[PDB]
Scaffold this active site. Structure first.
Site, PDB file in Angstrom:
ATOM      1  N   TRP A   1       1.058  -1.248   0.107  1.00 25.89           N
ATOM      2  CA  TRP A   1       0.087   0.053  -0.143  1.00 25.89           C
ATOM      3  C   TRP A   1       0.897   1.290   0.166  1.00 25.89           C
ATOM      4  O   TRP A   1       0.519   2.210  -0.498  1.00 25.89           O
ATOM      5  CB  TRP A   1      -0.989   0.062   1.073  1.00 25.89           C
TER       6      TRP A   1
ATOM      7  N   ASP B   1      -1.409   7.108   5.899  1.00 19.49           N
ATOM      8  CA  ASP B   1      -2.464   6.112   5.334  1.00 19.49           C
ATOM      9  C   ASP B   1      -2.743   5.174   6.695  1.00 19.49           C
ATOM     10  O   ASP B   1      -1.980   4.134   6.941  1.00 19.49           O
ATOM     11  CB  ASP B   1      -2.080   5.357   4.330  1.00 19.49           C
TER      12      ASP B   1
ATOM     13  N   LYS C   1     -12.552  -0.779   7.389  1.00 15.88           N
ATOM     14  CA  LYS C   1     -11.794  -1.786   8.087  1.00 15.88           C
ATOM     15  C   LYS C   1     -12.073  -1.616   9.668  1.00 15.88           C
ATOM     16  O   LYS C   1     -12.487  -2.697  10.133  1.00 15.88           O
ATOM     17  CB  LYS C   1     -10.481  -1.831   7.600  1.00 15.88           C
TER      18      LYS C   1
END
Ligand SMILES: *Cc1c(COP(=O)(O)O)cnc(C)c1O
Ligand SMILES: *Cc1c(COP(=O)(O)O)cnc(C)c1O
Ligand SMILES: [Cl-]
Ligand SMILES: [Cl-]
Ligand SMILES: [Cl-]
Ligand SMILES: [Cl-]
Ligand SMILES: [Mg+2]
Ligand SMILES: [Mg+2]
Ligand SMILES: [Mg+2]
Ligand SMILES: [Mg+2]
Lengths: 360, 356
Positions: free
Chosen positions: B101, B171, B195
Site C-alpha cells: 500500500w 495512511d 476496516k
C-alpha cells in the site's frame, strides 16, 4: 403516525420494497450470516449483486453491448472534472449547453482544464426553457458536447436529444435517468449520481461507450482515468458495496413495475396532477418553466410574493410535507417527483395547494 | 450456522450498530423516512453528519486546529489528492515504504511531482518497520508519508516518528481508531472507513487545518471540503450514518483505550498460537513489528497452506486467504472482529496441526 410526504430533491424517496428488502436481510444476506456491508467485494455474494445491478440497468435502458456500466464514487460533481480530464485534450474544446446551475458547474470544471465553448444557453432568460437544437454553435475541434438532461434546480427538461456526429454527446442525467426510455446510442457517455432517481447517495452510475474511453490518458491519476475503472469492472479499489446493493434493489423494483416505459407513464401522470393544479390556479401559483420544457422530475413554482411563499412552505411543513423549499440559490418552491415518489403524495400536495389558495 | 468474519476490507461490523441500523431503516428519528431518504441539507441529516465528526473528535481526542472530513473515493483517491494539494513545484513527496500500500501511494505522487524514499524494508519483503534513525529526509520535503499498518504484510508502526521539517502524513486505513493516537504528531491522517470504522463508501480525513490552491479541480481541493464541512456535494449519507453507529459502539465499550485492550487480546490469541506451534505455523512479520490488525502467516508448504484454508472455509471462517500478491494466510482482526472468533481460529489451528 401523522402523514409524511417526501418531496426531497436529492437524496430522495426510495421505493418501500427496496427498503423493506434491505431491512429484512441486513444482518444475514444470501444466507452468509453477514450483512452485505460486511462482505468482501471479491466474494461471490457481492459479485452477484454488482453484476446484477449492471444487468438490470442494461436491460432496463436497453444499453448496447459496446457500452460499459461503471459504478464510481464521488458524485456527479466528480464527473464534472473527470470528464474533461479524460477527453478534453490539447487543441480541443469542451462545448457545453447551459440550461441551468448544474450545467454551469460542469462548465466551470472544464474551464480549469482546457478550452471551453457555450453551444447555446438560456441563462439570459433565467433558464426557463431548453434552447432549440438549431441554435447550437458547434466546433470542429469539440472534444464533446455536454448537456444537462434535467435541470434540477430550475425544473426544465429535454424532451428529446440532439443528433450529434462531430463529437460525443455527453449528458448529466442525475435527476432524470431511468425515468423514461432512452436511446443510449445517441450518447458517448451518460452519468448520474444515484441519489435522485436510482437509490442512495455514494455511488455514481456512468454509462460509457467503451472505445471512447477505455484507453490510458497520460498524466491522469489512476483513480481519475475511466480506463482504470473500465478495465477493472469498477472494482479497482473498494466499491461502495451497500450503495450498489441498494441500487440493485431499486432497479429490481423498476423492472417489477414494467420498466422504463411503465415508469414514464406513472411519472407523466404524477407530474400532470401538479401542473394542472398550477395551471388552474389563475396565477396564484406560477411555474418557472415554459410549458414546452416542463420537467417531469422537479416542479418549480412561486406564489405571487415571498410572504405567500413562506406561509405556503410553512403550512406544508406543518402538514407533513418534506423538501418543498426551492434550492437555496433560487428560492420559491420545488416539488421533486422522482420515480419512487408515490402518486398519492402528489394528490396530497394538490389538496394542500388548493386549500391554501382558497383560504388565502 | 457458525460464521467467523475475518474479511480484510470491507469487514465485520459491530452487531449493535447493524441491529440499530436495521431497526430504524424505514423510520429514522421518527421522521418516517429512512436515513437514506433524507436530504443532506436537512437538519435531520446534518445532526448525524456532525455527530459522526464529534464522536471521532472525542474518541481520538482530535485538537481544535484539526478538521475532520468525510470524502468519497477511498484511500486510493487520497493517494493522488494528497500530492495534488501539497506536492508543489520544488518540493518532494517523501515516502516510507513498509508494504505494497505504501508503494501504491508513492506511485500516485510520482505522477505529480518529485518523490523520494526516506526508508524502505522492501528488500527484505517488508518484514519490519524501519528504524526512524534511518530516515533520509529533505529540507524541501512537502510531507513525509507512512503507512501505519501494512495490511498485506501484517506489520504495524509501534509508535510514530517525531518529524518537524514537514508534515507527517499517514495512511491508517487498516488501524485507525484501533488504539489511542497522538494526533498532533501528524499533519494529516486518512483511512477508508471499511476496516475499523464503518462500511465502504466513506473516507475519513483528519487534517491540520492551516496546512491545507490554484488550478486543482474543485472536488479535489481539501479546501473545498474544509470550507463546506464535507457538504460541498452530496456525501455518502448512509455510510456516514453507519460510521456514527460504529463510533457510538466504540464509545460505549470504553473508547480507544478499551478497544486496544480487546485488540491486543485478539492478536495475542493468534500470535501465541503461532509461536507455540513449533514451526507448524510461521508468522511473516518480525516480532517487534507484528500488526495487531492483520496477522499474516503460512504453513510449512503450499499444500498444507491450501489444506488449512479449505478446512477453515468448511468450518465457517471467511476471508483468511492471504493477499494474492503474497499468498499464505491472513487473519484480519479489526475492531469489530470479536474475541470469540479469534478463539475459534486458535482452536481450529490447534486441531489442524494435531491431525496433519
Ligand atoms: C444533484 C445534482 C448534481 C450533484 O450530484 P452530487 O452527487 O451531489 O455531486 C449534479 N448534477 C445534477 C443535474 C444534479 O441534480
Ligand atoms: C484497504 C487499504 C487501502 C485501499 O482502500 P480503498 O478504499 O480500497 O481505496 C489503502 N491503504 C491501506 C493501508 C489499506 O489497507
Ligand atoms: Cl439546474
Ligand atoms: Cl439540486
Ligand atoms: Cl501492505
Ligand atoms: Cl489489503
Ligand atoms: Mg423482479
Ligand atoms: Mg399511499
Ligand atoms: Mg451511547
Ligand atoms: Mg505465553
Amino acid at each position: 403516525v401523522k402523514q409524511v410526504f417526501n418531496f426531497n430533491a436529492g437524496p430522495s424517496a426510495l421505493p418501500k420494497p427496496a427498503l423493506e428488502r434491505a431491512q429484512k436481510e441486513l444482518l444475514n444476506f444470501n444466507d452468509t450470516q453477514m450483512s452485505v456491508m460486511e462482505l468482501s467485494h471479491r466474494s461471490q455474494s457481492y459479485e452477484e449483486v454488482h453484476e446484477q445491478a449492471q444487468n438490470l440497468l442494461r436491460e432496463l435502458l436497453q444499453i448496447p453491448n459496446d457500452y460499459q456500466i461503471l459504478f464510481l464514487q464521488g458524485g456527479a460533481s466528480l464527473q464534472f472534472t473527470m470528464l474533461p480530464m479524460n477527453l478534453l485534450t490539447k487543441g480541443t474544446i469542451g462545448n457545453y449547453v447551459l440550461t441551468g446551475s448544474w450545467s454551469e458547474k460542469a462548465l466551470k470544471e472544464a474551464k480549469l482544464l482546457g478550452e471551453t465553448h457555450i453551444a447555446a444557453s438560456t441563462k439570459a432568460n433565467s433558464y426557463q426553457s431548453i434552447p432549440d437544437f438549431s441554435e447550437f454553435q458547434l466546433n470542429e475541434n469539440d472534444a464533446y458536447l455536454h448537456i444537462t438532461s434535467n435541470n434540477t434546480i430550475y425544473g426544465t427538461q429535454y424532451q428529446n436529444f440532439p443528433e450529434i456526429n462531430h463529437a460525443p454527446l455527453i449528458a448529466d442525467m442525475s435527476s432524470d435517468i431511468l425515468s423514461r426510455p432512452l436511446k443510449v446510442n445517441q450518447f458517448g457517455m451518460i452519468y448520474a449520481g444515484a441519489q435522485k432517481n436510482l437509490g442512495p447517495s455514494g455511488v455514481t452510475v456512468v454509462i460509457v461507450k467503451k472505445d471512447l474511453l477505455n484507453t490510458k490518458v497520460e498524466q491522469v491519476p489512476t483513480m481519475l482515468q475511466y480506463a482504470t475503472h473500465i478495465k477493472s469492472d469498477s472494482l479497482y479499489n473498494t466499491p461502495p458495496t451497500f450503495s450498489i446493493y441498494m441500487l440493485r434493489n431499486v432497479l429490481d423494483w423498476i423492472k417489477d413495475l414494467g420498466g422504463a416505459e411503465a415508469i414514464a407513464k406513472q411519472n407523466e401522470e404524477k407530474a400532470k396532477i401538479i401542473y394542472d393544479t398550477i395551471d388552474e390556479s389563475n396565477g396564484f401559483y406560477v411555474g418557472h418553466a415554459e410549458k414546452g420544457s416542463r420537467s417531469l422530475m422537479n416542479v418549480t413554482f412561486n406564489l405571487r410574493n415571498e410572504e405567500l411563499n413562506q406561509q405556503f412552505l410553512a403550512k406544508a411543513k406543518e402538514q407533513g410535507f418534506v423538501g418543498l423549499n426551492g434550492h437555496r440559490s433560487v428560492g420559491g418552491c420545488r416539488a421533486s417527483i422522482y420515480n419512487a415518489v408515490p402518486i398519492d403524495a402528489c394528490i396530497a400536495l394538490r389538496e394542500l395547494m388548493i386549500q391554501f389558495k382558497e383560504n388565502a
